[PDB]
Ligand SMILES: [Ca+2]
């Protein structure tokens with residue numbers, strides 16, 4: 001039973017978490033919701049809605065639908081302005097190329113909407129509508145809800161239990177475990193080995209190259 | 221014996237670690253040296269020399285000096301984005317109020333320090349501070365913390381080092397100081413503890429709220 005692959009995008013295949021953080025920071029500052037950047041970095045990988053609720057509750061207050069919407073817009077705009085900073089992570093393309101050449105099926109699964117996802121894909125010189133990908137616009141709920149991964153397993157014709165989830169955030173690992181998939185964590189999104197293991201990572205690697213070099217430990 | 225306090229600055233009292241990461245990345249790309257952000261982030265808190273050195277393993281002197289200057293210019297451009305971390309001002313004032321001595325100790329030079337101190341509204345010449353310009357080596361070498369203890373006239377052994385990075389924690393243990401880790405630099409609790417942190421708090425407000433677990 002050959003392994004099928006569900007990849008997170010931002011922080012996992014492209015070096016874009018820190019741009020995402022900066023974009024949220026600028027949006028939140030614009031809206032007088034001053035939050036230290038480590039707290040924003042902690043939530044990267046959740047869909048914006050859940051992230052906003054989450055930061056909200058942890059600061060003791062709550063954010064209306066209307067401001068959530070504006071924060072979202074501000075975030076997309078700030079991200080766009082940072083689009084050319086985004087580079088593919090080491091091994092990322094080579095890993096994807098390895099899988100195709102090997103007939104292993106993979107899908108991308110991101111809490112980002114079509115906009116962010118199109119930007120990061122450029123860095124991997126990939127055309128969105130030419131690959132297997134699921135976005136926040138494809139489901140009701142983002143990470144850590146299992147929705148995205150389930151839709152991804154479905155898009156590639158693999159049972160979710162024949163799947164390996166690859167992610168850089170607590171939220172990817174959490175969602176992986178919630179649908180009982182096998183989760184593997186990458187350090188390239190800035191989360192540490194401790195956090196990723198506690199959120200359910202079975203193995204943790206530096207980046208796609210490191211993972212590629214150990215593909216046997218973890219995939220068939 | 222009352223506790224004396226040695227604070228890291230960048231990421232401990234000010235929320236500047238991400239600007240620091242971003243200035244390093246700007247400087248690296250200008251020199252066409254590819255490097256993932258997380259790798260840069262892992263190093264913030266070492267001296268620029270150790271940093272770049274350590275980076276290569278994972279760079280000419282000529283090249284190194286261009287990067288140091290490029291980083292300093294890029295970091296300046298980002299100064300307006302930097303603000304105090306919650307509780308940082310209150311914590312320092314609480315220490316003053318209680319006549320507890322403190323000193324700031326940073327691996328950066330006077331230029332980055334000054335920028336960071338502005339967010340605390342501190343006068344660099346009106347406070348106890350030690351920078352990379354006052355010692356031979358930056359963190360994790362114990363030099364700065366030793367300088368800092370000397371500047372406030374306290375045994376390093378009766379000092380709390382408060383930092384956000386693995387390099388702070390390492391240096392603290394290397395001079396037998398008690399180390400406390402803050403999450404506000406983006407390092408995790410596991411990292412900070414494995415580098416020697418005795419306690420780990422979220423930020424200066426969390427620390428101030430738990431000050432009794434940790435300080436006499
Ligand atoms: Ca991610």
Ligand SMILES: [Ca+2]
Pocket residue numbers: 190191192406407408
């Ligand atoms: Ca981290």
Ligand SMILES: [Ca+2]
Pocket residue numbers: 228229230231232264265384385405
């Ligand atoms: Ca620091």
